[PDB]
Amino acid sequence: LRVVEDSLGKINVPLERYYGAQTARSLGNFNVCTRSDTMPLQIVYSLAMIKEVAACTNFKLGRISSKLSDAIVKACREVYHGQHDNEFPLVIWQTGSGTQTNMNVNEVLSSRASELIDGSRSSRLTVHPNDHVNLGQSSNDIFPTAMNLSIAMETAWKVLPSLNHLINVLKIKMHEFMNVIKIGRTHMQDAVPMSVGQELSGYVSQLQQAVDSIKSQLPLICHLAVGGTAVGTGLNCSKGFDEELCVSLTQLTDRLYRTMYKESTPVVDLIFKPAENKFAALAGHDALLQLSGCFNTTATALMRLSNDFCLLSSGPNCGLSEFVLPANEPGSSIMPGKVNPTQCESLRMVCLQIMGNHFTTSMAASQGQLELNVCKPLIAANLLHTCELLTDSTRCFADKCVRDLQLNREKIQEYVDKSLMLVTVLTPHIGYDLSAKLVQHASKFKKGLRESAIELNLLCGEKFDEIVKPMEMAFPH
């Protein structure tokens, strides 16, 4: 157990650990779901990235030596390559600025950088957390910068590929079943013929719309608060520091993608720029809430996909039984041989959690107080949870449900034959009023449209077979 000190006095940390007084204090002061609600590591990794480019920029502006800059840079890289995950024990439910996690990163980099320079660990640190590692920075501007950076990388590199994968797997089935005629249902009542491919193209469209909205929003969250310092004025920040750091951060993220993902083109290039208004970048998270809204819309689209796949696979004998979903596992502890649409149920629960995350972000975004919104850790945790949910859940559904989707061709054709709303094609011939008489007749006396149309002397058996052709109704031009 090492001993460290600050303004408030003396406190213990484990001797193995790189974090210091401020981390020790936050550990004890914020004992709220410490087991499960750790600040997301994506925030810690992005803070490490920002401190690296801050070190390089501070050296280029002649504000710090190259001995210090170099040791910090090597410390930063160890953190975002995941060699110090256990140096970050602080929870989401800390200070609303994320100051304590910023100090946590400052203290771990400070002490490690100090170890690399010295060669041993001493009580007197060569690298100061405030004077060196945090130089030209507040938590007020650097925490929002880490929020936007971490969420831009999650969204561009993890979320978009997953959504594109699900779109691509639906497109395979869309084409595979484009010529399979089924009956449309509106208000869950029998409607007119359409193809299975047409129905799948509806989900592809909704998900493509979602992907297009997210791609458009990304460049706007790549506007960074960095350089605003305490209240947005940029006091204690060098002229050009915001612009130079955003250039370096663009190049570091460009290199990082290409180390992580070989022979791939990013779906969107991440070009970081200083925010046009640093006051708005501290006082609000409008651009992150707009992305939250894009994820909310994505969730509502994914909800219909799940619910429609559950409805169309209902059965096997007392339901619709149009769709056959792959059977991945036994369904029931009590009902032997029952197989449930469990990939649909997983996605639907994930979607409700994304929508709830969006309502939480909305309320948190609305709680601005003068110069600083102090719900930042909650906005970060909810958007980063949504990124992981969309990433993992859409890929699960694509691979464990859509990939091996099959049809019950006999049941589907039974529905095409039996829908009374085939009569719809006859309304331009025999009129809307006489078509209703026809359907009312077919229902009462439990007979088909053809037999009924002859029986009421309204259409000849020859004319009926000429007018009513299912596949031509699904594609009428």
Added chain:
Amino acid sequence: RLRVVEDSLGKINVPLERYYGAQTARSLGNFNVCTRSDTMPLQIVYSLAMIKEVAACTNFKLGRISSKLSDAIVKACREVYHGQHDNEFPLVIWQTGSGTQTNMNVNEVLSSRASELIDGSRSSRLTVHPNDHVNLGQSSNDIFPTAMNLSIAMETAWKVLPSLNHLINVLKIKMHEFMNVIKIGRTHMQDAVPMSVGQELSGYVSQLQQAVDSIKSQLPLICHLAVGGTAVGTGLNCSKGFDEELCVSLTQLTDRLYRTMYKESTPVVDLIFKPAENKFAALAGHDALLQLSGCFNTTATALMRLSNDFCLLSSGPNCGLSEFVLPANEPGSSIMPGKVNPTQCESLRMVCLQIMGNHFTTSMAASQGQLELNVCKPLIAANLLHTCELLTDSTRCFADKCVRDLQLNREKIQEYVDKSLMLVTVLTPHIGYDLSAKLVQHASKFKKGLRESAIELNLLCGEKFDEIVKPMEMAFPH
């Protein structure tokens, strides 16, 4: 055409015929926000009129105003809540967050009407002062929350609960009518084991009875009124006993009103008004109303499953489940002739989403307390009263236009009982879960029935099977 009126800020015009004064003319101009559709609910105005009546009587009995004045205020009050002045209240929800301008809107109408009743003529010199007489011993801070609780208590007790009890009672008819009709339960929308249509209907009855019981339990908690707290809850400029006497008189007034409105009828709950134990909490928060909002939120979630289940079970007529036949109340389509839709289900489902949204809005408003006063009061009142009318009208609509004349497709239902392979569930205590699984897998992958599969596999004889496989006995295994 106009009447020059005067406030502490100065003079302004109102139409000659109106009884509303200067602060109403000001509010009207200052808050031009959805003025066509977002008028402060009249239930708040009527409840304020009822409070002003007993407030006058209580102030007279505590020797703070005259019988001449007190008698005049009472008669004007009665004209307002009998609905003889509905055009004297044009202010919107989106006013001051204390509802002060609606309080002063009622103060002015009663001020000037009571003044015309005494003098027998309308002179610009008012005999009854809206602040000194009509608003005597009151703040907007305590009276507007008192009118919120009073308005919502009467809506909830007298309109919402009778509507919910009516829907439960019509569901109970059908529950009894179909208690012995065996259908197949569905879990995960997959075929499961037998149950009765009545057992399935008992599920919605139970959820709706839980909702009624939660609402009946919450009502006496919202009958705790802020009255007597005045500006910040200290009771400054309110005489001792005023709150306790006003609550007794209000209890008696609401008791009389119910028996005027509803003949040969026992109220589902007696509204007994009492002062809140903590007047500071009664001004600074709306916890008791937000708890009632929660009860309505849970009711909406129960009604949502009733809607979605009736839509699902009535799907068809030829390409769906087709267990339920809903009354056909209209033709149904503009292009697909003879198509009838479950429109009563769709109406109720949209209403339930609006109630849940109303609950989310009320939750957010209740969270925005600042020191001594929550200033989102009109928004909380508007959302809660809108939910009361939606619950009242929609549950009765669904009861009378869907459930009352619900019929079954008994042919389709019996088809499902014969074909469900999960009837195998009953064989698990004889051959085990493992060998029961092997059996239904054979029945499924050889398009074969359960009995043929258990013989061909040799798991149970055809006589032993006939013993353990009775659908009516499976729904009521006792």
Added chain:
Amino acid sequence: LRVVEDSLGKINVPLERYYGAQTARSLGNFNVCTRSDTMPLQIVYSLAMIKEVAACTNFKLGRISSKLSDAIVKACREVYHGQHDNEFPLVIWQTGSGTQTNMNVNEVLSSRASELIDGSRSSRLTVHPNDHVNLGQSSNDIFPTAMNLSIAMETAWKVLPSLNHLINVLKIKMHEFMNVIKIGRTHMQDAVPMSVGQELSGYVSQLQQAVDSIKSQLPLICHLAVGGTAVGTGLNCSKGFDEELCVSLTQLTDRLYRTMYKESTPVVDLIFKPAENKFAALAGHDALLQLSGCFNTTATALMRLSNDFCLLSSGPNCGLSEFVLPANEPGSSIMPGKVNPTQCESLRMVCLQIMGNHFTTSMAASQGQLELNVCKPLIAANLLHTCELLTDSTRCFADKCVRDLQLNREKIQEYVDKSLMLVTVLTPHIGYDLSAKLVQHASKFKKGLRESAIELNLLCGEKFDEIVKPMEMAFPH
């Protein structure tokens, strides 16, 4: 009382009224908040516009005579110019497709058009609601078309001008007070100097971001379902009807703007195009929910504006008292001469109602069932309520609060003089650790930074006056 008939039998309507059987039935069948929850007239007006261009397009494709087309067209115009508001009594809480309001418009146009042709009103109508007025249309495609059209016009012509007006009034005060130095507050604690203009520029930025998002979303909601008919296949719709109707609707909306608003350029041109995927346009409202999200973000920005104006006008003696808001009315029934920030309280309640409207739309958007989302009237009513709230509330706040905003210059300057976090400029001189000692001293012995800095022999009285200059701290470059 006239008598009319349909499939379900015979029913009464008032003899004065133009609506018929389907409207009569919906009146009786959906007795839910009939006093207050009427289907919004903006939906009825947009349905009238669509039926007009449908009549013209049906004639150009040779599918209806010019006698009928012409009478319908004149009927349509009477409705959207507001000469038949009382012919539409149906509520939001009807069928989830809006079929009944579509029939209501069909019946009123049918009967009026029939009156203009005949010259008198007869039981036998010349103009059929289904065969003529609804020709080539379902409620499944025409109700979503009326939703997008009505909300595009509300947003482009009413919402955007109101938001632009509020931005323009904040910009006047932003410039007027750009050189007035005040103290920033973070976590509601004393921070560093900034100008009042800088603080106002934060709200201008957030509202400009909101306006830019809404302008970008409008062209996407101008993609219309029209021509999808029952399930999206376009059965019983003529080839080119969707494309020709969208051309005519673009030109009608262009003319309508210019009759409504003289010597003005629309903020956005409304160019209607057929939706690329008619299935998605029936099964979902993703584009309307994306606009809902833009309105949600706008509400969170307007929330901080309101709450900040309430906080900074707190007083007059026991609060911050930086801002003097115009006194529009007496504040209290009991506390004489008290004046409350009632324009802030109105806007804050409006914003909570917009966010609640967005949560309701989100849940309604998520409830898709196979080919048709049947929560359409609820989505329309909530977005159109939000349009009216944003339109009227932002203009109220702009004109009744921001326009005549004044400052308490003496109180503001007292705060600049007294904030101990002026010490922030000294940390690059005397260090972060020695600056903290300075502030701790100034607090304990209730003395100023200057007197304290000398007393601790840390900075000379001359050097201190040189380093600490408020106006230079707000604009450090």
Added chain:
Amino acid sequence: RLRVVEDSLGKINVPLERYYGAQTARSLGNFNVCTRSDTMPLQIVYSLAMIKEVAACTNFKLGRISSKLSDAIVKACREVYHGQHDNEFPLVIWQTGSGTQTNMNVNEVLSSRASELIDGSRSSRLTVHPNDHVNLGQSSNDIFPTAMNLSIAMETAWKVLPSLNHLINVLKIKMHEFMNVIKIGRTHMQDAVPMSVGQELSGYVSQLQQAVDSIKSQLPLICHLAVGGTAVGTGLNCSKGFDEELCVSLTQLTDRLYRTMYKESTPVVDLIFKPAENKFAALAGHDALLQLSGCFNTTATALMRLSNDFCLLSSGPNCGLSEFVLPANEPGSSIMPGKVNPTQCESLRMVCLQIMGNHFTTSMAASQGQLELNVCKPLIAANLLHTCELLTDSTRCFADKCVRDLQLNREKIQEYVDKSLMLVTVLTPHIGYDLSAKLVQHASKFKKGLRESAIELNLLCGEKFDEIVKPMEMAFPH
């Protein structure tokens, strides 16, 4: 390294050391969704272990299984809820919506452990079958909702209520310590009339007591368990009396557990488990849990005003209200040295927004019932248990790290009492509202005090004013 396991679908590998079986190996691979952080809460797993214990005992006493088998299941059960197998439960929340895979995850661990306890060695032939023995007379459909209600009942009774009572008790200390310190109330953030700091603190105590009382009242309603309903609520393949005997044994088990955990302690509520009156509603909906979610939502809204009010009142130290001095638990800033922030307020406020969001999520899940089974169960459980831990930890954190050592800036508070012009409110019954308004307008627009303005205007003599203007008497006008 691995153990070949077998299900009705086929064979698969698990690590040699693990007690989990085939359906756990399958679920793990099939639902790779936030596997690092969204593990099914262990409270659900422990409650399932407790139910399996009494289920074994009840099945033995009803003559449906052996004492050899029953005794073995009990010992494995105890190892699970004592926390000796936490790494045997790797499945996520985002599994099947019935929680079947977590039910089978517990069935398998108990199956194989009980099998090793009897045989004294782990053979691939299991003496205890997870379906036939451990899951005897049970469905996931009735047992997972039983574990939901049991897990949330114990969290709520034993952790949440003691945390809320602790915060009320620390607020009551300060309420008493400052009952006679006069401050100025603020309505609309404008200066209002005198009140005591203790009166203001009594507002949060009242709101938090209302929350505790609503939660205590809801707890016996969630102790109504789905157990006995099996597949669809009919009780098919459950023996008569099993539910009633299991609930008696569970009551006794939870009673023993409390007294093992907490010494010299009376539970705030006794958990008395009973079968639900309607098993169909107990499977198809979670109305009772959503009502408790509502109670937590209202608690969050009350805690939000406590947070925002403490942040507001502690604003400064030189350019804010500066009435409250919050304990300084840390240095506070990275660039502004000596700046201490109200971090305990910010923590609690973020927690309250998360609880409200959790309530919105739970509301939406509760609305998505389809026929016989709500299949959003893990999501409802996860949200409610997360809210229980947040309420438990955050209210205690705020109590101990903020309220306990709350002090006042008595100088600043007394400045506000002297300067508030709304002290004029007390003069309204003497000179009237109109002439009281004219007075304060003169005092404001001539930078003059109230007494000087009433003399210079001639409204009340300097001696009569000294009679009617006492701040301590204004806060307690009796």
